[PDB]
Design a protein around this ligand. Structure first.
Ligand SMILES: Cc1nn(C)c2c1c(=O)c1cc(Cl)ccc1n2O
Lengths: 355, 9
């Protein structure tokens, strides 16, 4: 393998990856669109900006790789390869990643004027993707337009697992990672999180696909809330009673908000021409949204219920919706952790195996 | 029905 200069950190990729150029920044790493001559297909390469020079960011990647190995689905990115630019367990300090380069990220169609069927289908797919991880007890907690790529033929795939995992009893105290414009309430407020929080995102997404503007403009996590409750009425006392002790007071002390009717949040026009070809009509996407775009964490729809719902229903091909959920060994627990050194090794336990 | 096949990016 060789190297090529980029931004600041230079690369150390294998020869089978020519004409190497950058494509996207990265909160956790970097990524180029080099051509895998040895396989024929320009591939996406990312090496991770934060290997394991800490404690809180190695655990993330480690969990991402393993999830990567045990994943597989037409709507979920698939690992093409993993290599290390080092020789012995000593010099180890960089793990690169290969993967099929798509045609662009949703953050592209976000700026396009879909027309149902298409959207109708992507949602379905996106929906399908999530569904996978869920059906095996897994949360993406980062579904956002940025991490959603297409392929010139309404084909879609979710990407990045750098932080995904499963839980039930956990906070965050570091939401300074899960991009807030699409951060869910159970997230924001240090509330517990089942595993549907993913859908929330998915909503803010649809919102982003029909309004063209983000949905809940954040100026600091603290103002996030303010901009959402401002658009969804102040949550019910049933919800309130749910929050931790402290967050409560603040949360109650808020300025009681009207909330809006989705007939008003998303008026007809914002929805693709009603070229009806079935159960596909304006009032449908909206109807769906109002089942997603919801604060209480328990009264918000779900994947299972999602797919099996009118604006999705149609192309519900079990061949890819009732997908055999992926499994894992027993190295995953999530709320636990190991040394800030052997973490490195368990990582090496990968790059070597996968080659 | 059908399924879309193209997506003009
Ligand atoms: C941004 C962006 N645009 N495109 C086309 C992207 C991206 C990506 O950020 C991207 C990221 C991974 Cl990990 C894999 C493939 C990717 N592709 O294909």
């Amino acid at each position: 393998f060789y190297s090529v200069e980029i931004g600041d950190s230079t690369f150390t990729v294998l020869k089978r990856y020519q004409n190497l150029k950058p494509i996207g920044s990265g909160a956790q790493g970097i990524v180029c669109a080099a051509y895998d001559a040895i396989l024929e297909r320009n591939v996406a390469i990312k090496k991770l900006s934060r290997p394991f020079q800490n404690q809180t960011h190695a655990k993330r990647a480690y969990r991402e790789l393993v999830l990567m190995k045990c994943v597989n689905h037409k709507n979920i990115i698939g690992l093409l390869n993993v290599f290390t630019p080092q020789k012995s367990l000593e010099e180890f300090q960089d793990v690169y990643i290969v993967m099929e380069l798509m045609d662009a990220n949703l953050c592209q169609v976000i700026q396009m004027e879909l027309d149902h069927e298409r959207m109708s289908y992507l949602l379905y797919q996106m929906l399908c993707g999530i569904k996978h991880l869920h059906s095996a007890g897994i949360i993406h907690r980062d579904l956002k337009p940025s991490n959603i790529v297409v392929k010139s033929d309404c084909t879609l795939k979710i990407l990045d697992f750098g932080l995904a995992r499963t839980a039930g009893t956990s906070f965050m105290m570091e939401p300074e990672v899960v991009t807030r414009y699409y951060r869910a309430p159970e997230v924001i407020l240090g509330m517990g999180y089942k595993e549907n929080v993913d859908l929330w995102s998915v909503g803010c997404i649809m919102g982003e696909m029909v309004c063209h503007k983000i949905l809940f403009p954040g100026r600091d996590y603290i103002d996030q809330w303010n901009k959402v409750i401002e658009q969804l009425g102040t949550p019910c006392p049933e919800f309130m009673k749910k929050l931790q002790p402290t967050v409560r007071t603040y949360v109650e002390n808020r300025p009681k908000y009207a909330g809006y009717s989705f007939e008003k949040l998303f008026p007809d026009v914002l929805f693709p021409a009603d070229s009806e070809h079935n159960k596909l009509k304006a009032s449908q996407a909206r109807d769906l949204l109002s089942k997603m775009l919801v604060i209480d964490a328990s009264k918000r729809i779900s994947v299972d219920e999602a797919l099996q719902h009118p604006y999705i229903n149609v192309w519900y091909d079990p061949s890819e919706a009732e997908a055999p959920p992926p499994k894992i060994p027993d190295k995953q627990l999530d709320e636990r952790e190991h040394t800030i050194e052997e973490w490195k090794e368990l990582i090496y336990k990968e790059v070597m195996d996968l080659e | 029905p059908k399924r879309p096949t193209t997506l003009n990016l």
